[PDB]
């Protein structure tokens, strides 16, 4: 409704770096807000794409941003009669970023890893890895839970159980208020998908450079399965946290598995021990229900509601025809111990191949009326197909079925404007929460400032 579309702020990165693929707000010890942007195809030392992260200070004019430096050199450790190898070429550092406290977490989902032993090996596979940083103190650490030193032969003899060689840990990431990092690894357990969780404090204290394989006793990974309904579900394609069980001492997880049950798609809500509380199945095959998930209370009843994106949902149209437009589902949390029912609201896309619902961002209370609002991306929507972000306002009954505002892409075609969103933070400190929209296609980031309501 009251976002300012006339005077935007633009941040830009290197060409072809996909600057804007992922972003997030970041408050330092002094509460000064900055934007952290991921650029998964930024050039490394050997003029090879390794990815990179930028930490953009707030400035009404925007501009270029300083790099958040990380180690990009491949590592080798000959220990215990084995050779440990990390490969950072085309790892995609910055494929996702998340900020918690004064710490930044940037992930490289396709960082490869291998272990050699004489003529045998584990196999060079994308286990993924996360780089943690504390910009102010200069501290650095890493977390790579899916790494292992088991040789190929062993997996075959064990029928490929607990095979975490293709996790791609960091694909999606979230941090609980308590400070526990939660990484989604859609490739875990031979493409079933798994979650890895560990306290940030413990990730830092247990890490030392050069070790490559260290223990984090407090960590906790989800479980493998023999059920074909989970096969190639990419459980952990998207992740989020919230309160869905009444007990406030416990934190619940929300996991998207967009191809679960033979591409029917699904999203599940779990406890901290990965025990499933609820499961929401997709409405249509290949719609990619679960591509994105958002947790926020939109009807001001104090209870976190759930939003699920299905960017490829095909809508039924006259003469028995289907038009791929995308869809979002709203699930309002019921009073007390009860299961989430049917969707309370179905928001459906308009533009063909617009991919409405590819991203969903809680905005907080944008217009300051008492109900939280959200933003929904259609990276290839709009009459021009350049991208479009629609704002939906909260109300006592959930959400409004029609958008309060539509942000058309200021970039050229193919910018993927909206592929990443982030809101619910006052960046200019004007008392209204603001929105940052990524356009990795154009290697830029647009900042929309919320202003007092005109109407």
């Amino acid at each position, epitope marked *: 409704l009251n976002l300012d579309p006339v005077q935007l702020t633009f941040y830009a990165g290197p060409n072809g770096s996909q600057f804007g693929f992922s972003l997030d707000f970041h408050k330092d010890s002094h509460g000064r807000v900055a934007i952290v942007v991921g650029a998964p195809r930024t050039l490394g030392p050997s003029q090879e794409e390794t990815g990179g992260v930028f930490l953009c200070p707030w400035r009404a004019e925007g501009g270029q941003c300083p790099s958040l430096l990380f180690d990009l050199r491949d590592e080798t*450790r*000959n220990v*215990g009669s084995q050779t440990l190898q990390t490969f950072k070429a085309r790892q995609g550092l910055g494929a996702s970023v998340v900020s918690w406290s004064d710490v930044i977490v940037a992930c490289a989902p396709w960082q490869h890893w291998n272990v050699l032993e004489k003529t045998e090996e584990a196999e060079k596979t994308p286990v993924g890895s996360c780089f943690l940083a504390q910009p102010e103190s200069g501290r650095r650490a890493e977390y790579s839970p899916c790494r292992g030193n088991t040789l190929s032969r*062993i997996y075959v003899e064990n029928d490929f159980s607990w095979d975490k060689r293709y996790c791609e840990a960091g694909f999606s990431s979230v941090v609980t208020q308590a400070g526990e990092l939660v990484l989604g690894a859609p490739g875990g357990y031979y493409f079933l998908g798994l979650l890895a969780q560990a306290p940030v404090a413990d990730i830092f204290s*247990s*890490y*030392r450079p050069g070790i490559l394989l260290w*223990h984090v006793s407090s960590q906790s990974l989800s479980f493998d399965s023999s059920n074909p309904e989970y096969f190639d579900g990419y459980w952990g394609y998207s992740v989020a946290v919230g309160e869905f069980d009444g007990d406030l001492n416990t934190t619940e997880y929300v996991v998207g598995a967009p191809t679960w049950s033979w591409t029917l798609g699904a999203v599940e809500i779990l406890d901290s021990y990965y025990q499933r509380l609820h499961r929401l199945r997709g409405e249509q095959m290949a719609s990619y229900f679960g591509h994105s998930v958002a947790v926020t209370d939109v009807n001001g009843d104090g209870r976190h509601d759930l939003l699920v994106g299905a960017p490829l949902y095909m809508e039924s149209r006259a003469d028995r025809k289907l038009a791929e437009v995308g869809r979002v589902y709203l699930f309002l949390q019921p009073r007390g111990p009860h299961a989430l029912g049917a969707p309370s609201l179905l928001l459906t896309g308009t533009q063909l191949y617009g991919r409405f619902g590819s991203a969903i961002a809680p905005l907080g209370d944008l217009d300051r009326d008492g109900y939280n609002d959200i933003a929904v991306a259609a990276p290839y929507g709009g009459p021009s197909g350049r991208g479009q972000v629609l704002v939906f306002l909260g109300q006592s009954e959930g959400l409004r079925s029609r958008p309060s505002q539509v942000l058309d892409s200021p970039f050229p075609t193919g910018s993927a404007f909206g592929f990443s969103l982030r809101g619910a933070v006052d960046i200019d400190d004007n008392g209204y929460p603001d929105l940052i929209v990524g356009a990795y296609g154009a290697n830029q980031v647009a900042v929309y400032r919320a202003q007092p309501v005109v109407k």
Partner: antibody
Amino acid sequence: EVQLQQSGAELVKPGASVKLSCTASGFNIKDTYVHWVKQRPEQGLEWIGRIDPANGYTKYDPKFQGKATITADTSSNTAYLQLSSLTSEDTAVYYCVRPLYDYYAMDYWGQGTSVTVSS
Amino acid sequence: DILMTQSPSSMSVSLGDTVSITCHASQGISSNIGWLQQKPGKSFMGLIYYGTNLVDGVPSRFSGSGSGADYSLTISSLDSEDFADYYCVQYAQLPYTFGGGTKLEIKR
């Protein structure tokens, strides 16, 4: 807190077979590797072997192959070291060890177990 | 098997002294070394792992250094408890191997 409670001192006769234990306290034995080390006054420290309690795979120094057999039961959260066809040279103090962070390191040690072989 | 020549076998020193034990391997071990301490009539304690990294709880007066096949544990400002046996261990190759050991004795 990580603690390795090893079994009480053993006293057996030559040719017998003893089985030592190393129960984990404050953590799941299944977490890390578990090594066994032998100490003698004159010969010093000698690595016997290790085991991964999660899957049960083991590794031995070819000096102990046949003599020593390392096992582990995740249920009782304990790791064992059995020695057969004992002799006077087997009279030594045995320690169970596990790493802190580094997968391959040897940081935490049990109190030890005194073994004596005599008729 | 990698041989660990640890010297000196023993040394007599006083409190506050800065002493250094050394370890030598039959071949390179890329900082894959660990230092241990065994107080008289007691079990072992971890000091250093992977060359230089202190085990949680160990005072900062301890420090591991060196590379290749030659490494050293250094104790700055000796304390009354520091008088005990110290061993080095390599885990670059199996089987793991230990050093001869070094007993710190009180001088007088």
